[PDB]
Each structure stands twice: as structure tokens, then as C-alpha cells.
Ligand binder design. Sequence first.
Ligand SMILES: OCC#Cc1c[nH]c2c(Cl)ccc(Cl)c12
Ligand SMILES: OCC#Cc1c[nH]c2c(Cl)ccc(Cl)c12
Length: 278
Amino acid sequence: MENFQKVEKIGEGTYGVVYKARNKLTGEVVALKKIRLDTETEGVPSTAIREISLLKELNHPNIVKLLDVIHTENKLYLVFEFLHQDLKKFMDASALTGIPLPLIKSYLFQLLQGLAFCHSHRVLHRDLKPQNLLINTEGAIKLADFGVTLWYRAPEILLGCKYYSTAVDIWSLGCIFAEMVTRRALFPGDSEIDQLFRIFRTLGTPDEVVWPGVTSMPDYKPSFPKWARQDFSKVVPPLDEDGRSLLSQMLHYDPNKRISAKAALAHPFFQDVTKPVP
Ligand SMILES: OCC#Cc1c[nH]c2c(Cl)ccc(Cl)c12
Ligand SMILES: OCC#Cc1c[nH]c2c(Cl)ccc(Cl)c12
């Protein structure tokens, strides 16, 4: 578009490419997401418009602002507020020493605030990963790029549940929390079955006892191997008992037992929370 000048590519996803760009009218630097629209959604755009309006109405300090939506030339441009660094690049830059624990806890706390807000406005992220968590110099972190890495995918999605809940975001955020702490991805699966089996090898193969209804799920197989659960003390050292307890609740198999963002905000782990400068 004539009012935007591309500075550089900053992201790529399934639906489009993301550029740092300058808005010639406001002088502001923005993230520009370009989506090529199929003729099917152009013919029946009502659901797409409803979902994008829900994203646009989100106003929260821990959510990347959707500034403008431009429909032109069989394309949709989403104009977002711009931030300079993502958590994946920050984790990488911090890999010799670790992100300090007060900063891990501040980031976790703020993302839970963002998710509690999304979730109470019937918005799910669906694809949380370090690369779509954006950070600034003031110690803020923000959810971006609302819904190929499988590492953060909730087990109910991998088991073919079509009608999944807000609990999928809590699972992804739990995986990210473990990763900040240990400096290793929790479940680095390279296929859906390897993803599933990595979760099973750590948390135990789920059954009807721990996850009522699991054996009736679309992609559940009786022939899944049966692994015993490991202790969290070997999974996320040196996280303290408050952190381990919180993580265990974020990684409950049953989506209905998994902690909500709002209840996680109240966990004793956040008793000493502060907002450090990275
Ligand atoms: O938010 C204003 C708007 C709009 C749209 C017009 N056509 C669309 C298609 Cl095909 C997809 C998604 C959107 Cl938001 C629009
Ligand atoms: O689609 C993948 C992506 C991305 C983004 C990278 N940087 C961003 C900023 Cl600064 C704002 C908004 C988005 Cl979606 C991205």
C-alpha cells in the first residue's frame, strides 16, 4: 500500500508475511501483516470480519495493538503496533546465563494478565510460542500474532479435539515457562506423534483416571505405549516448589482441570512478583 514503506521482513506465518514498515501519514513505525485472501472468504467474509473485530477491540497492556485493517486488491493488511524484540531472540541472547528468575516471573505474570483478558473477551490465542511474545525496554511483554512448530501444542489438539478451550493457551504458556527456566524446550517434538509421545514420556500416558474421556478422543489409539509419569523435580530444576506446583497445574492433561489464567494470577508463586528492566 502507498501509505506504507517496508523497512524489513520481521516475521512469516501460515497466513502471511510481517514487515517493519513506516506509515507515511502518521510517521509511525508499525508491523504490517499481509494476508493473501482466497476467493471463498471474499465471497463469505462475515466470520473472518467477526474474528478480526474481536482482535481489534482488545485493549490491554499485554496485547500487541491491532491499529488498522485494510482490505484492498484481494489482500488483507493488519497494521500492528511495533516492538523491537521477541522472547525467542531474548531466550537465545540469554542462553549462557539464563533469563533472571524475577524477569521470568514478571513475564509469566504479564502473559497471564494478557491471557485472562483475551479469555474473558472470548478470544483464544491458539498458537503461543516464544517468537510471538514481544518485549520492550520497559520490562513489558505482549501477546502477538493471534491464531510449523508443534512444541507448545496442547495434547487435546494433538488428539484431534476440534472444539478446544482457552485451556490450550495455558498449556502453551506452561511449556514456555519451563523453557525460560531450563533453557531447553520442554517437549521438542518434530512430528505430531513424536510431540504426543514426548508429552507422554514426561507426564505419563494419560488414561480415563487422569483425563476422563481421553480414550474417546478422535486420534486416541489403545496401542499408544504406556509410559509412567516422571517427577517435575527432574523436569524443571532449579524451579522452587511454588513454580513447580504452578507449572503442574498449567500442564494438567484434562483441559477442565488445567488452571485458568485468572486462577494462576492468584498462585503463591506471584507473591514476590516485581517488574524488572531487561
Ligand atoms: O475491519 C473492517 C473490515 C473488513 C473486511 C472486508 N473484507 C474482509 C475479508 Cl474478505 C476478510 C477479513 C476482513 Cl476483516 C474483511
Ligand atoms: O506471523 C508471524 C509474525 C510476526 C510478528 C513479528 N513481529 C511482530 C510485531 Cl513487532 C508485531 C506484530 C506481529 Cl504479528 C509480529
